[PDB]
Amino acid sequence: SATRRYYLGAVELSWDYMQSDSVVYKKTLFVEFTDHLFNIAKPRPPWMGLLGPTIQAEVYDTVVITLKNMASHPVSLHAVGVSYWKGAEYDDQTSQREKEDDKVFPGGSHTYVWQVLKENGPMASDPPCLTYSYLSHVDLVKDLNSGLIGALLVCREGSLAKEKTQTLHKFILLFAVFDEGKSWHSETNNSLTQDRDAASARAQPKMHTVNGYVNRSLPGLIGCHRKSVYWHVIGMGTTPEVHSIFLEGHTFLVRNHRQASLEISPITFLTAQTLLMDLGQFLLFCHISSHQHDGMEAYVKVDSCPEEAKKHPKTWVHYIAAEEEDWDYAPLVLAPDDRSYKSLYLNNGPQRIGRKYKKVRFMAYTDETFKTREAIQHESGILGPLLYGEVGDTLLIIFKNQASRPYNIYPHGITDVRPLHSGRLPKGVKHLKDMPILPGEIFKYKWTVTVEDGPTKSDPRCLTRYYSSFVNLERDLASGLIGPLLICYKESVDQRGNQMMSDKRNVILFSVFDENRSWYLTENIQRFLPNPAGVQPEDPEFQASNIMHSINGYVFDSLQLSVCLHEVAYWYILSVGAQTDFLSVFFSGYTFKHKMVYEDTLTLFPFSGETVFMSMENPGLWILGCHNSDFRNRGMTALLKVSSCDKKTRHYFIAAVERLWDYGMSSSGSVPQFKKVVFQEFTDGSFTQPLYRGELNEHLGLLGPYIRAEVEDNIMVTFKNQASRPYSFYSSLISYEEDQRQGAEPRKNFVKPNETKTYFWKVQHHMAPTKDEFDCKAWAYFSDVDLEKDVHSGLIGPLLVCRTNTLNPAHGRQVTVQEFALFFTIFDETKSWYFTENMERNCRAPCNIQMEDPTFKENYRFHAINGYIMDTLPGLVMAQDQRIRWYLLSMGSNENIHSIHFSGHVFTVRKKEEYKMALYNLYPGVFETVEMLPSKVGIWRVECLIGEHLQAGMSTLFLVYSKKCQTPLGMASGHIRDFQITASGQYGQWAPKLARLHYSGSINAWSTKEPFSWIKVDLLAPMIIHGIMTQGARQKFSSLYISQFIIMYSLDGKKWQTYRGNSTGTLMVFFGNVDSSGIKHNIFNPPIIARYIRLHPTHYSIRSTLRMELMGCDLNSCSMPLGMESKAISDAQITASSYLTNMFATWSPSQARLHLQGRSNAWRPQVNNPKEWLQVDFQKTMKVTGVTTQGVKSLLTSMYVKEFLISSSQDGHQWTLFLQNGKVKVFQGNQDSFTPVVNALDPPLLTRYLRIHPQSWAHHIALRLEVLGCEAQDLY
């Protein structure tokens, strides 16, 4: 274990972005220093720029970061991906010492210790170094937008030394979107802002930047020739805004996958690897057009450095020509609907052109003179002839510009384009991509595929690329110059062109052809419109009619993809259009194999493309489209008509009961109660009595019941709508085999109010997790009547499909792993099905009801986790050292990208191989199952780090408790005072005060006479109650067994919850022994967390007499034993002043084990004096909650220390006698030799050594002690 010590410091510096180091924007950044004196800063490479110093560590390493705060605003240091103990200021219930790390005030410092453990180490199938980051978590939004961020690297064991020899040449890239408006250092005009507008200063424009440098001013990026340079990418977006980072002529490698671009969602860490096999000053630019206008571009100045079954290249002769054609977007559609949105698109008027437009389409030809067209199918539509090619293949693209405008041909994946025989390119034309081929010219191209652009072994068989004209980046695509390119792997495409066993080669283009930018715009205006003078350039309606959201160039289900049944086929999806945001492309009830993982949502970034692989077996007609509500409404749909290519019943009952749901504002002027519809499980088919939700299912919240089923476990879900609107039940897994009866009619569910419908399907392998995945895979079910509105209303629930023999048969769920499903989304109640009723009931006059007002929409917007806003989601309890399987999922609009983070925790993602991650980025429709191992006990916060998403409140608290803190809570010991105990009634003799365990006389618990007599005990603070003792009891010759009570608990004394736990019934019957004496100590599994417990006896054997004792530990679960009876500490650590070690009866300190008998059963010093001690070592700074001294009975004589002391020391020399308020606290040791006496330290002592001084004893000093406490940080 090598300790690596850094000295960080947050300093305010006048950053200047563009100008290598625009306007001088004040920024606060982490700056490393040489020593703790904080005088000299370590030199920084120029390419780092506005980025915190890199912190590197290996497995089993430890870092001691001393963070000073020289700024004028509070700063913390919250590392990600490493283990540490209590830098986040949230509710965790910890003392002042453990809250200092959460926030650091200016002029102060704190020594964080992010010890790296084996769980943080990369797996075998992972890159040698993993990319993480650290930041300031005081405010998140303002901190990130103020530049406070660094980098963190967790490499393999000893891998730093090897990296020194074979330098992997790692680059640290920060794709920051720093916005000066929402930063810690935003314009100070807010002070005395009257008559001095803050918007005059350009409204603090956001700066799309790379490492703090904008518009190609990165002065340090220098690669090496033939060098596999590694990249470490960190995204910094407070707002949910994406980026697409491209490298000129270079393709990245992430997870052994050929990423043509970097999908940089707001907060993302990834490790890339680009094999630099070329010289020149390349460009690292953002390709999405709205960000292409921005300045997120950089220089990659690669330089030379000193040195230390087709299988042949085949030519591809093609004759592509640009032809002017009148394209009909929706030719086979019916009349436009009244004056709806369809009439905006497919209708003709003074401001509307209609469905026909003048464009240019890439047309194939069978000759070099371009005088004979080929056969173009209706499926392709606007797409040109298909282009392909294995690695190392030449593509003779003979291109003729038959159209009246200069157009050319150029691929996007292939980086080697040769102009056939060496010819002189005209002046000003450096490459073949910007060649303006004049009309009639037949200039040719040759595309040689290289390994650097071909698919890898881990990648799918073919790659989804495209070819298009590049004379103008926007208008050429807007005019219909698009075509597919298939860079396939070797031994998969023959010399003819068709793929080896090309069953159904289907290409779909989810792209938007903005007809406002078509080259033939004025021609369309003066041809297809009656009076061209009526056209206004700035008319929003005229512009709106131009835009045509189309699939393959078809709008409003004009494209009918006739796919065969029982047939295996591929789908190369291409989102290359005017869209500036990702598309949640989905197939109706069709999971597709993507990244070696089955899923029913493919996220495609602009100018990208991902191939998928699905086997068609579900009959019936389906609607392929995008999850985006608006895009599907504008016409981004297609009929995936799949007809027959003619050559353990786990029953569930779900109802959409419309219940008044609040977002937890009651616990977080009246509480705004919103009416929402939610799935709900019901016991019987009449939907009268529902399944009550126990403590283990309390975390579900707004979600529906767990629809759990194993492989080949045919689910049967009966759904009856208890609502006002006709909702439905539909999950992506439902195999509608009943659609085979007729074949073509669209599926209808539309379950009317007070109507019932049955869904029955068999779970198949493709929806089950694979061998390399976890035990249970997550899905979702919702309503397909209106996906967006139904989800916004609250109809959503997880459908877990697990592997064989994973769910426990008795409980119906996997018990060995604590399953936990989460759902992140934004809930704008202005867009709910019940919005009118909710708004009337929640906001009455003088409310200013304005659906267009942004602040009004904010109030109805709720960034919630499972329906709860401010860390309110209850029911998150996990046992330490126990496997957990979180099912993270999210669904919604395009602003629904979240960065799930478990504070002080990391999780493995067995997606394709066993990968390791610490910040998962979820996309709408993506249902990913992860597994985590809880290390430290306490309260940690699950949160999304996406700026205002967390600021508005998207976060929750989960509790990790130790299953070893079962200490008595103080009932019988007298720690629980009598005034805290109250009851309602009593017996003739027994009283509520006299309820202590093993009390004097016949009194041993509480007893009562009148029925329905509850008794409650106020613990004055929430505690994890692990159970209540139940042994034999009696009184006045009345032998009585357990009284069969039911427990109610509450955190405030009002919200009384009945406990069921593992019980399927609404309550758990706490029975036990039967005569008078059997020991049936009740167990709370899962434990009860409440400030108030209450006992309600139901059975009345004799009168009510029982036997009880509260057993539980506190919130921090620090009552666990450090280990004395378990021999956790070695004999060498236990030293004594003297001992009476003998032959038969050794009296050495090594025999001080708790509850050990025999001749050698305890420790007895040679001299019985008050100055003796029993110093024990921990080898680590350990928190000591208390000391439980005990006596012993050596043969016949009974000896015990009646009173002892404590003397702590961090090294064994600085002994400190324990003192309570200045007077030595001499704990009461023992009263007999057979019963331990607990003596809690107040406050608990963190120390490496402590001494037990036996001030008083009986006969000979005897000490069978046992220390209590939990592990803590060292004092580095």
DSSP string, 657-707: EEEEE--STTT------EEEEEEEEBSSTT--SB----STTGGGTTS----
CATH superfamily of 1149-1271: Galactose-binding domain-like (2.60.120.260)
DSSP-assigned beta bridge partners for residue 263: 244
What gap in Å lies between CA 656 and CA 687, rounded to an integer?
11
Amino acid letter, 251: T
**Do 981-1113 and 1149-1271 share a fold?**
yes
Structure tokens at 350: 């003074």
Q: Which residues contact 805 (CB under 8 A, 6 or more apart)?
A: 710
Report the DSSP pairing between strands 651-661 and 597-599: unpaired
DSSP 1032: -
Amino acid letter, 595: K
Amino acid letter, 96: Q
What gap in Å lies between CA 51 and CA 131, rounded to an integer?
14
Chain centre distance of CA 568: 33
For CA atoms 138, 144, 146, 152, the dihedral sign is: positive
Q: Report in angstroms the alpha-carbon separations of 451 from 246, 349, 427, 549, 1142.
A: 18, 53, 31, 35, 78
Other Cβ atoms within 10 Å of 228 Cβ, number:
13
Please give the sequence-ordered ranges of beta strands (E in DSSP) within 682-765, or none if there are none: 715-720, 730-731, 756-761
What gap in Å lies between CA 919 and CA 888, rounded to an integer?
12
Among residues 172, 78, 33, the alpha carbon closest in space to that of 941 is found at: 78
Other Cβ atoms within 10 Å of 847 Cβ, number:
11
How many helices (H) and strands (E) would you count in the chain? 13, 77
What gap in Å lies between CA 954 and CA 947, rounded to an integer?
10
Cβ atoms of residues 46 and 220 within 8 Å:
yes
| Residue position matching structure tokens 């191989």 | 913
Tell me the domain boundaries of the chain: 3-186+203-302, 318-643, 651-961, 981-1113, 1149-1271
Amino acid letter, 885: R
Residues just before a chain gap in the chain (C–N exceeding 2.5 Å) are 21, 86, 308, 647, 668
What are the residue ranges of helices labelled H in 317-374? 341-345
Cβ atoms of residues 513 and 548 within 8 Å:
yes
Cβ atoms of residues 616 and 561 within 8 Å:
no
Other Cβ atoms within 10 Å of 921 Cβ, number:
24
DSSP-assigned beta bridge partners for residue 1039: 1034
What gap in Å lies between CA 663 and CA 667, rounded to an integer?
10
| Residue position matching structure tokens 């369809």 | 342
Cβ atoms of residues 1247 and 1276 within 8 Å:
no
What are the residue ranges of helices labelled H in 697-829? 787-793
Cβ atoms of residues 149 and 134 within 8 Å:
yes
What gap in Å lies between CA 99 and CA 102, rounded to an integer?
5
Cβ atoms of residues 803 and 711 within 8 Å:
yes
Structure tokens at 548: 């045509």
Chain centre distance of CA 5: 31
Structure tokens at 760: 């029955």
Residues 1045-1070 as b/e (b if ≥16 CB within 10 A, e otherwise) read bbbbbeeeeeeebbbbebeeeebbeb
Q: What are phi and psi of 757, to 5 degrees?
A: -140, 140
What gap in Å lies between CA 865 and CA 663, rounded to an integer?
9
| Residue position matching structure tokens 């291109």 | 399
Structure tokens at 1048: 């109610």
What gap in Å lies between CA 1047 and CA 1056, rounded to an integer?
10
DSSP-assigned beta bridge partners for residue 281: 301
Amino acid letter, 430: K
For CA atoms 348, 352, 353, 354, the dihedral sign is: negative
Residue 951: its H or E element: helix 948-952
What gap in Å lies between CA 951 and CA 947, rounded to an integer?
6
**CA atoms lying within 13 Å on the CB side of residue 147:** 33
What gap in Å lies between CA 513 and CA 607, rounded to an integer?
13
Cis status, amide bond into 1243, omega within 30 of 0: yes
Q: What are phi and psi of 887, to 5 degrees?
A: -105, 85
| Residue position matching structure tokens 């001299």 | 1167
Q: How many residues does the chain have?
A: 1276
| Residue position matching structure tokens 């491209």 | 246
What gap in Å lies between CA 926 and CA 823, rounded to an integer?
11
Residue 171: its H or E element: strand 171-176
DSSP 1067: S
Other Cβ atoms within 10 Å of 73 Cβ, number:
19
Report the DSSP pairing between strands 781-782 and 674-681: unpaired
Q: What are phi and psi of 192, to 5 degrees?
A: 55, 50
Question: What one-character-per-residue DSSP string does 433-479 give?
Answer: TT----TT---EEEEE--TTTS--SSS-SEEEEEEE--SSTTHHHHT
Other Cβ atoms within 10 Å of 100 Cβ, number:
16
Residues 119-157 as b/e (b if ≥16 CB within 10 A, e otherwise) read bbbbeeebbbbbbbbbbbbbbbbbbbbbbbbbbbbbbbe
Question: What one-character-per-residue DSSP string does 1077-1122 give?
Answer: -----EEEEEEEEEEEEEEEE---SSS------EEEE-TT-TTSB-
Cβ atoms of residues 504 and 569 within 8 Å:
yes
Calculate the CA dihedral of residues 35, 161, 1274, 959 and round it to 10 degrees.
Answer: 120
- Determine the CATH number of domain 3-186+203-302: 2.60.40.420
DSSP 289: H
Residue 495 burial by Cβ neighbours in a 10 Å radius (0-12, 13-18, 19+): exposed
Residue 678 burial by Cβ neighbours in a 10 Å radius (0-12, 13-18, 19+): buried
Report the DSSP pairing between strands 444-448 and 1219-1220: unpaired
Report the DSSP pairing between strands 1057-1058 and 1039-1040: unpaired
Sheet holding 262-264, edge to edge: 262-264, 243-247, 280-286, 297-302
Q: What are phi and psi of 232, to 5 degrees?
A: -125, 105
Q: What are phi and psi of 1034, to 5 degrees?
A: -165, 165
> Solving technique for this entry?
cryo-EM
| Residue position matching structure tokens 């050698």 | 1160
Other Cβ atoms within 10 Å of 1170 Cβ, number:
12
Given in angstroms, what resolution was this structure solved at?
Answer: 3.2
Chain centre distance of CA 696: 21
DSSP 790: H
What gap in Å lies between CA 19 and CA 668, rounded to an integer?
46
Question: What one-character-per-residue DSSP string does 527-559 give?
Answer: HHSS-GGG--TT-HHHHHHHEEEEETTB-SS--
Q: Report in angstroms the alpha-carbon separations of 1274 from 81, 85, 855, 995.
A: 20, 10, 48, 43
Cβ atoms of residues 906 and 860 within 8 Å:
no
Residue 464 burial by Cβ neighbours in a 10 Å radius (0-12, 13-18, 19+): buried
Cβ atoms of residues 353 and 524 within 8 Å:
yes
Report the DSSP pairing between strands 674-681 and 651-661: antiparallel
What gap in Å lies between CA 857 and CA 1257, rounded to an integer?
72
| Residue position matching structure tokens 């394209």 | 327
Structure tokens at 13: 């510096």
First-to-last CA distance in the chain?
14
What gap in Å lies between CA 941 and CA 86, rounded to an integer?
12
| Residue position matching structure tokens 């390994």 | 451
What gap in Å lies between CA 762 and CA 711, rounded to an integer?
9
What gap in Å lies between CA 17 and CA 216, rounded to an integer?
10
Q: Which residues contact 1001 (CB under 8 A, 6 or more apart)?
A: none
Q: What share of the chain is helix, strand, coil (3-state, %, to 5)?
A: 10, 35, 55
Amino acid letter, 692: Y
Q: Which residues contact 813 (CB under 8 A, 6 or more apart)?
A: 706, 708, 807, 819
Cβ atoms of residues 625 and 575 within 8 Å:
no
What gap in Å lies between CA 648 and CA 119, rounded to an integer?
38
DSSP 224: B
Q: Report in angstroms the alpha-carbon separations of 184 from 13, 166, 239, 616.
A: 13, 41, 15, 54
What gap in Å lies between CA 539 and CA 229, rounded to an integer?
50
Structure tokens at 236: 């910094």
- Rg of the chain over Cα atoms, rounded to whole angstroms, equals 36
Structure tokens at 958: 């989960």
For CA atoms 150, 154, 155, 160, the dihedral sign is: positive
What gap in Å lies between CA 68 and CA 942, rounded to an integer?
27
What gap in Å lies between CA 1180 and CA 1210, rounded to an integer?
9
DSSP 974: T
DSSP-assigned beta bridge partners for residue 602: 585
Q: Which residues contact 750 (CB under 8 A, 6 or more apart)?
A: 726, 728, 785
What gap in Å lies between CA 943 and CA 929, rounded to an integer?
17
CA angle 751, 753, 758 (to 5 degrees): 35
What gap in Å lies between CA 178 and CA 801, rounded to an integer?
42
CATH number among 2.60.40.420, 2.60.120.10, 3.40.718.10, 3.40.50.720, domain 318-643: 2.60.40.420
Maximum distance among all Cα pairs of the chain, rounded to whole angstroms: 118
Other Cβ atoms within 10 Å of 1231 Cβ, number:
11
DSSP-assigned beta bridge partners for residue 1250: 1176, 1208
Q: What are phi and psi of 533, to 5 degrees?
A: -65, -20
Calculate the CA dihedral of residues 759, 763, 764, 767 and round it to 10 degrees.
Answer: 90
Among residues 1101, 1086, 1098, 1108, the alpha carbon closest in space to that of 1005 is found at: 1108
Q: Report in angstroms the alpha-carbon separations of 204 from 25, 210, 448.
A: 9, 18, 47
Structure tokens at 467: 């070819």
Q: What are phi and psi of 1207, to 5 degrees?
A: -140, 100
Q: What are phi and psi of 30, to 5 degrees?
A: -70, 130
Residues 414-438 as b/e (b if ≥16 CB within 10 A, e otherwise) read bbebeeeeeeeeeeeeeebbebbbe
Residue 620: its H or E element: none
Structure tokens at 1076: 């008078």
What gap in Å lies between CA 484 and CA 387, rounded to an integer?
6
Cβ atoms of residues 435 and 409 within 8 Å:
no
The domain made up of 651-961 has a fold known as Immunoglobulin-like (2.60.40)
Q: Which residues contact 1123 (CB under 8 A, 6 or more apart)?
A: 1129
Structure tokens at 176: 């920051």
Q: What are phi and psi of 711, to 5 degrees?
A: -70, 135
The domain made up of 981-1113 has a fold known as Jelly Rolls (2.60.120)
3-state secondary structure of 120: helix
What gap in Å lies between CA 967 and CA 989, rounded to an integer?
30
What gap in Å lies between CA 947 and CA 462, rounded to an integer?
38
For CA atoms 1069, 1072, 1074, 1076, the dihedral sign is: negative
Cβ atoms of residues 60 and 88 within 8 Å:
no
